[PDB]
């Protein structure tokens, strides 16, 4: 006859410990992330909507135009780096009507 232990406060205290706004934080993994990857367990501690990193690169010193110059590294105006001199020399007949160089091996 020790029911007073099981019911002591509520159960233990309430259950155990607390929080800023007490609910068990579940994810809601949809977002602007369209149905394309797997990512069945993303986790991710809240985050900020979808688009955030833009006016800062979080590297070198590139944000304000003061320190944006010289270290202008934030992927400003993009370009492909397939390796080698695109065609290289040997393409022979890839059978395309213009040399697409997204990716290239050998080096």
């Amino acid at each position: 006859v020790d029911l007073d232990e099981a019911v002591q406060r509520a159960l233990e205290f309430a259950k155990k410990e607390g929080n800023t706004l007490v609910i068990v934080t579940a994810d809601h993994a949809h977002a602007s992330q369209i149905v394309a990857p797997d990512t069945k367990a993303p986790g991710l501690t809240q985050a900020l909507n979808t688009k955030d990193g833009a006016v800062m690169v979080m590297s070198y010193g590139n944000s304000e135009e003061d320190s944006q110059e010289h270290t202008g590294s934030q992927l400003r105006i993009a370009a492909y780096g397939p390796h080698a001199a695109n065609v290289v020399g040997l393409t022979d007949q890839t059978d395309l009507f213009y040399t697409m160089k997204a990716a290239l091996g050998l080096k």
Binding site: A10, L11, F13, A14, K15, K16, E17, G18, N19, T20, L21, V22, I23, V24, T25, A26, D27, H28, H30, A31, S32, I34, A36, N49, T50, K51, G53, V57, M58, S59, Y60, T71, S73, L75, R76, I77, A78, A79, Y80, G81, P82, H83, N86, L90, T91, D92, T94, D95, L96, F97, Y98, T99, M100, K101, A102, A103, L104, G105, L106, K107
Partner: protein, 432 residues
């Protein structure tokens, strides 16, 4: 040439080149007189010592030195007559070399396999014709006002976008769960640290009343210990607050990219800015739907060569923003980039095959549009237009991406693409 064109497995083809004994002894000998020319002693050599002695005794060390080059000469020789574009990485596995005898080495590299286009018409893409309408312009500007809002209190009136201070004592299904209480929490109505039902019981009342609300956790709600259960929350309203709209002062509103600081100039400024973000994100939307549909619909054994290339670009991209690691990028954990890069290869293979099948070529005016609009995202377009259009190497690169986009829209003309017209609330504004 003395070669044994074997295959290790599938793509990995092993052209085991063995340079002929006579050809090595001659090639090394020809390189040894070049060493003598480099040190200028060739003209001091009176021919008193015959060439056999300087090759066999002195040049006994300088052998693998010459073979390093010779392996590459037979490589470029082989792949040209074999008509193979050298994929993988040329792996010269040296069997052995005896004194002036045959040098066996297994050159292992990849070949390009059979590519199959399929399920092209099966792919379900969406084409959202999104613009930043007056609703989106003023609505999102209003959200910006309510994010940068002046803190104030009011006597007993709470609405959907105000602020509150409460202490609650909730219980889920009848259990005083994890915590139970949450004392003096400041709820800015418009946050997302609580579910619907809860917030709806806050945002339509006044301070002084201490009541309960009935909420229920969704079936989609990933916390199983809460999922389906009805949670009763005794909400104690102690403070009614407002995140009041701040002043859109001329000296403040100008700072959003308006010269004179006109409100109509801000609406116009965020029209062009949010649309510059928007249409590029529409491009990523429709393209990634087509691209995923392509990979998922199609089968091919993917060369590690091209995977290493896409990983490498993603390593540079990572290191760039990971403190700017100066060409340390190569060492960055491959597994982070492995899958997405291999995906980006399957993209390049299928879209390249769509360029072939649909017989496409990059249009200069299309490349021009891409340049000027990508550069219109900056206050420096002119130097970008010059950086691409005055450089055939980088203009050809931008012909590659233009033709790749033509390849996407070539698949879209085949695929189940549902075109719709809608507001900015569609595309990135999926805040759920």
């Amino acid at each position: 040439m003395q070669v044994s064109v074997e295959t290790t497995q599938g793509l990995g083809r092993r052209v085991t080149i063995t340079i002929a004994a006579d050809s090595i002894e001659t090639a090394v000998k020809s390189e040894l007189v070049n060493v003598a020319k480099k040190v200028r002693i060739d003209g001091f050599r009176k021919g008193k010592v015959p060439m056999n002695i300087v090759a066999q005794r002195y040049g006994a060390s300088v052998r693998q030195d010459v073979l390093g080059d010779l392996m590459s000469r037979n490589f470029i020789d082989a792949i040209i007559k074999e008509k193979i574009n050298p994929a993988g990485a040329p792996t010269y596995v040296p069997g052995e070399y005896k004194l002036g005898e045959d040098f066996t080495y297994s050159v292992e590299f990849e070949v390009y396999p059979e590519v199959e286009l399929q399920g092209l018409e099966a792919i379900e893409v969406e084409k959202p014709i999104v613009e930043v309408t007056d609703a989106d312009v003023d609505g999102m500007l209003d959200t910006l006002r309510k994010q940068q809002a002046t803190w104030k209190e009011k006597d007993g009136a709470v609405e959907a976008e105000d602020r509150v201070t409460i202490d609650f004592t909730g219980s889920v299904d009848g259990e005083e769960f994890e915590g139970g209480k949450a004392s003096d929490f400041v709820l800015a109505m418009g946050q997302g640290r609580m579910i619907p039902g809860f917030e709806d019981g806050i945002k339509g009342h006044k301070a002084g009343e201490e009541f309960t609300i009935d909420v229920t956790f969704p079936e989609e709600y990933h916390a199983e210990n809460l999922k389906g259960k009805a949670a009763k929350f005794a909400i104690n309203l102690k403070k009614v607050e407002e995140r009041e709209l701040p002043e859109l002062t001329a000296e403040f509103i100008k700072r959003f990219g308006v010269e004179d600081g006109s409100v109509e100039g801000l609406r116009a400024e965020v029209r062009k800015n949010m649309e510059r973000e928007l249409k590029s994100a529409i491009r990523n939307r429709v393209k990634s739907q087509a691209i995923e549909g392509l990979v998922k619909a199609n089968d091919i054994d993917v060369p590690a060569a091209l995977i290493d290339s896409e990983i490498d670009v993603l390593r540079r991209q990572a290191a760039q923003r990971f403190g700017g690691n100066e060409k340390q990028a190569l060492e960055l954990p491959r597994e982070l980039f492995e899958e997405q890069a291999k995906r980006r290869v399957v993209v390049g293979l299928l879209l390249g095959e769509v360029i072939r099948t649909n017989e496409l070529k990059a249009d200069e005016e299309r490349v021009k549009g891409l340049i000027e609009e990508m550069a219109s995202a900056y206050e420096d377009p002119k130097e970008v237009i010059e950086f691409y259009s005055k450089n055939k190497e980088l203009m050809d690169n931008m012909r590659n991406v233009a033709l790749e986009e033509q390849a996407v829209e070539a698949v879209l003309a085949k695929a189940k693409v549902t075109e719709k017209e809608t507001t900015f609330n569609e595309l990135m504004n999926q805040q759920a």
